[PDB]
Design a protein around this ligand. Structure first.
Ligand SMILES: [Zn+2]
Ligand SMILES: [Zn+2]
Ligand SMILES: [Zn+2]
Ligand SMILES: [Zn+2]
Lengths: 189, 187, 187, 177
């Protein structure tokens, strides 16, 4: 079957007061991302929450010299934003729903995502979350190299910069040969 | 720099009433494994506890082995003075706890990433079982280009003949260095 | 449809005048290995010849083994009817030749990618040596989530003790299916 | 030490008459790409030519579309057989995917890769992202990378610097500010 990957939709990346917030454009996808996730779950798909995980003063982390402290373990910054957070409280204990700490941008890097997907004979990944040109993009490239078919939920990905969101969407379609879908998981043309 | 990998030295694998215990041969290495780990830590080495983690019906081990090392259960606790060591130094930045689901410590973990961050060129392997989790970890380290040290008195298997195969494989095929509890090369 | 992996069955590993010969036990599987390969090809399976290739100061085997399987030599040619099979059907789209530098057929190759392109879920392993290149390949396949079949009469080791450790490992640890030269499960 | 990666700078990618041609902007980096590659080689760096191999319209078939463009082809004629110079066939955009690039770099204990070639937002980007995930320091030779569209070239350069923490350098391997 299929797997939906929910990438970094947390307080720190989304909320107005978030430590490394993408701001309004990330907040704007809240309805669509929660909708498509509940739909995927209802359709029997596996759901993988792949969430940035930082410790305070990790001098070996490549991001430590680029970005201010964010998504710290045990803080409110790692909480899922909007109805997605309600969904996790309701269905997080379900065997088809996973929470996965990550340290790189890509959901595959240093995680057991690929292993879990192959156990389940998953051939298609559906990507949602933030940021379109960073974590979503890295995850998409890693999925491409690992031979997965790729679906991108257009109204359920967001970037801080609209120009970067556009580059990423074009890259998904023209380079990765991915399928762009809406919040109802129907193909867009 | 160097990293010591502590593989699956839990109650469920070592203790008498353990759900998938290796028994006496595993218990026999308790003194040596805690000594070598405390020494590695004192030498400024990074310490990685890589521990079997179970919940799931898609696991390959479900059709082979009985339930063991379940998340949250006391079966996942570290055996002997090694458990005491983790209580003391677990909070230190050089010591890590790492859940794994395959035999190899590298498979589906961020072990390689963490080692590369620290520019580690040599891994020091300890734990159980010599011919399973230790062997799988050693082969993955070999393919990832790490130099390998095996602490002979701090690895154990259920079957002595399998322990012997594994030791010979490490030396002759992987070009690993066999060392003692004092981290001195064995000849 | 499945994939058969043919590991290192060359002159230098097998032939009496080979640079690193396994001797009689490797020569003994010559009939079974070419029969099972032809059977796999006939039923539509993909065939992957994964062959050791030496040219290099930074190679890990340089300090452990004498020069063998050198590029452009007769030593890299497939032994027996297996060499005849590649002469006949090497140009077929389902038959592949890939050079490897580690023991495992997966390490630094595009084997996983090629298998995933074809939606292969099961690999069938043949060749030499059972406790080295075959074992490393099997462990990599296991970690990559493949079902594994081992053709018992078409794998060989230098020592019978090592051959038996490896077979046991495949069956008891990896959950692999042991099959005969007709690709039927052995009991 | 360091390794320079030379990505897909062939006739099909660069030349006027080649398939899937990038045209003028790709031709424009010819002087810089050969200059920086020679400098890296003279410094003792390892040189990896990672070249797409085929068997999008048909391009880079295993044919004349795989010869290295310009003075870089002359460099390879002079030093291609040196133990520090490699020719690597690839089937994905990334130079790491399905190759032994990571293995060869680890054997030599390389900590830093220097990326050159085409296209900045495709093969170069995919290679850089893989290098990041494999824990390498990254250098991008700005005047020795190119793409078809300037906006794509600028996105990729911004991504390297701001997201991956790459060092942007010039043709003399000096950091740019
Ligand atoms: Zn972060
Ligand atoms: Zn287990
Ligand atoms: Zn060899
Ligand atoms: Zn191409």
């Amino acid at each position: 079957t299929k797997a939906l990957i929910s990438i970094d939709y947390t307080e720190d990346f989304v909320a107005d007061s978030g430590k490394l917030t993408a701001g309004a454009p990330a907040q704007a996808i809240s309805d669509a991302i929660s909708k498509v996730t509940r739909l995927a779950f209802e359709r029997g798909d596996y759901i993988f929450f792949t969430i940035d995980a930082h410790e305070e003063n990790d001098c070996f982390h490549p991001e430590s010299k680029l970005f201010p402290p964010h998504n710290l373990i045990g803080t409110s910054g790692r909480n899922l934003y909007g109805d997605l957070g309600i969904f996790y409280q309701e269905h997080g204990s379900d065997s088809r729903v996973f929470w996965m700490d990550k340290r790189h941008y890509s959901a595959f890097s240093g995680t057991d995502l690929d292993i879990r997907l192959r156990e389940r004979r998953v051939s298609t990944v559906i990507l949602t979350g933030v940021l379109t040109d960073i974590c979503v993009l890295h995850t998409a490239i890693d999925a491409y190299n690992l031979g997965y078919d790729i679906e991108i939920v257009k109204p359920a990905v967001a970037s801080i910069w609209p120009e970067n969101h556009q580059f990423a969407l074009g890259h998904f379609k023209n380079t990765l040969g991915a399928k762009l879908v809406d919040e109802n998981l129907n193909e867009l043309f």
